[PDB]
Each structure stands twice: as structure tokens, then as C-alpha cells.
Amino acid sequence: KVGGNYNYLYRLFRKSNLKPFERDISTEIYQAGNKPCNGVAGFNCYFPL
Amino acid sequence: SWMESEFRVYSSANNCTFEYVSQPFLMDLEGKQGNFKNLREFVFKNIDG
């Protein structure tokens, strides 16, 4: 669309590379910092999708 | 010696598109005169999905 089609999502962060022919639709908050990611969002806590 | 119908193993379900209702796996051969039992053997492996 001219405004932009935002109906498509793709994973960006994962713990490790997956094996071939696998599916992972899990949603969570990746540990991207020393401080543990409690929830919601914030600095050093990246949402993968 | 009356016991059956436990059911309700799970609580809720979600998106999934795999159903393989079919003929059962294990068959219990008749055991008679004692000292006569069948040893069920099963092995499961998971490679390339």
C-alpha cells in the first residue's frame, strides 16, 4: 500500500540457529543486555519480531 | 475391576494443522497359563523434521 503494508512479520533475534525444516512461532523478549528482561520492552531488551 | 474414561488430558488448544487419527499402534496379544507375556518395543527418532 502507499501507506505501507505492515501485515508481515519476521524474526530477527534468536538464541541459536535452528535446524532445517523447523517452525518456531514463539513470542518473547530476547535477553540483549546484562539486566534481565523483566517484560514489556526497554533498552537492552529487543523484541525479535 | 471397573476403571476407564480418564480423558481431559489437556486444558486448551490453539492454532494447529496436523491431524493423524488412524488405526492404533499397540496390540495386546492374549496371555494364557502364566509365564507368557508380550514385551512391547518402541523406538522414536527425529531427524530433518
Swiss-Prot record, chain B:
Region (Disordered): 1-14, 23-35
Glycosylated residues (UniProt): 15
Documented effect of changing residue 40 to S: In strain: Gamma/P.1
Role played: Attaches the virion to the cell membrane by interacting with host receptor, initiating the infection. The major receptor is host ACE2. When S2/S2' has been cleaved, binding to the receptor triggers direct fusion at the cell membrane. When S2/S2' has not been cleaved, binding to the receptor results in internalization of the virus by endocytosis using host TFRC and GRM2 and leading to fusion of the virion membrane with the host endosomal membrane. Alternatively, may use NRP1/NRP2 and integrin as entry receptors.
Record note on quaternary structure: Binds to host ACE2. RBD also interacts with the N-linked glycan on 'Asn-90' of ACE2. Cleavage of S generates a polybasic C-terminal sequence on S1 that binds to host Neuropilin-1 (NRP1) and Neuropilin-2 (NRP2) receptors. Interacts with host integrin alpha-5/beta-1 (ITGA5:ITGB1) and with ACE2 in complex with integrin alpha-5/beta-1 (ITGA5:ITGB1). May interact via cytoplasmic c-terminus with M protein. May interact (via N-terminus) with host bilirubin and biliverdin, thereby preventing antibody binding to the SARS-CoV-2 spike NTD via an allosteric mechanism.
Name of protein: Spike protein S1
Taxonomic source organism: Severe acute respiratory syndrome coronavirus 2 (2019-nCoV)
Gene: S
